[PDB]
Amino acid sequence: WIARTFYDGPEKNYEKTMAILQIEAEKAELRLKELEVRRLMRARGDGPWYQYPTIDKALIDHSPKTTPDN
Amino acid sequence: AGRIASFLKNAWAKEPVLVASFAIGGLAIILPSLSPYTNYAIRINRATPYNYPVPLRDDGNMPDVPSHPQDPQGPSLEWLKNL
Numbered sequence A: 001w002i003a004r005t006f007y008d009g010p011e012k013n014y015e016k017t018m019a020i021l022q023i024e025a026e027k028a029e030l031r032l033k034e035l036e037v038r039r040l041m042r043a044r045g046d047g048p049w050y051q052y053p054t055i056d057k058a059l060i061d062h063s064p065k066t067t068p069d070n
Numbered sequence B: 001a002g003r004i005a006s007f008l009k010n011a012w013a014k015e016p017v018l019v020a021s022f023a024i025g026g027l028a029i030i031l032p033s034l035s036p037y038t039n040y041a042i043r044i045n046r047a048t049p050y051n052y053p054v055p056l057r058d059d060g061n062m063p064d065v066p067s068h069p070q071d072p073q074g075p076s077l078e079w080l081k082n083l
């Protein structure tokens, strides 16, 4: 009676643990990958992250400058 | 109207320097926006060549660009001369 009215079968907890473990393992591997990706992007700078500004080239004036040699 | 006239008459007495200064400053602010010779001054400033006019390479598709200064095509300064 107690088992019927207060508790559930082993399958529920078993498969819930399976799902929880799967989620947590994915989160762990995601964290490790994210750290490695950050290291690579900060080292090389070829990614979208850690992009530091440079001078905009639309500011350059391309016109004769009173002197042939610029 | 009447109060403004009274104020201006009371200030024109015993404070003529301030009245004159405010009138002159107000005129200096307002009048330039209405004068028709301001654009003439801008055009005169544009017509003053400080730099060498660098010629453009002819490519067979430049009819409005002169080949010689004596040519009719190109900007003129007859408006400047008549001024």
Ligand SMILES: CCCCCCCCCCCCCCCCC[C@@H](O)O[C@H](CO[C@H](O)CCCCCCCCCCCCCCC)COP(=O)(O)OCC[N+](C)(C)C
Pocket: A004, A005, A006, A007, A008
């Ligand atoms: C001899 C026979 C009796 C044996 C003794 C049994 C006495 C049991 C008392 C102790 C109970 C321990 C806790 C049990 C309940 C745990 C919480 C919850 O799980 O129980 C819910 C039920 O709890 C009850 O609704 C409430 C219990 C409250 C007991 C209070 C007792 C004392 C009250 C005294 C009041 C006196 C009147 C006021 C006087 C001033 C149903 O659970 P549920 O989420 O479905 O579980 C999922 C699995 N299912 C679907 C298969 C069930």
Ligand SMILES: CCCCCCCC/C=C\CCCCCCCC(=O)O[C@H](COC(=O)CCCCCCC/C=C/CCCCCCCC)COP(=O)(O)OCCN
Pocket: B008, B011, B015, B018, B019, B020, B021, B022, B023, B024, B025, B026, B029
């Ligand atoms: C939009 C134009 C603005 C730019 C022009 C102004 C440039 C320079 C002028 C401003 C300088 C600073 C002015 C500071 C004002 C202080 C005046 C003041 O406090 O003096 C009062 C008195 O002066 C006044 O009444 C205050 C101003 C009075 C009005 C002055 C002219 C206001 C405008 C009049 C003309 C406006 C436009 C033209 C209208 C006329 C028709 C064309 C007290 O005098 P005290 O020496 O301390 O003691 C005397 C008593 N024992």
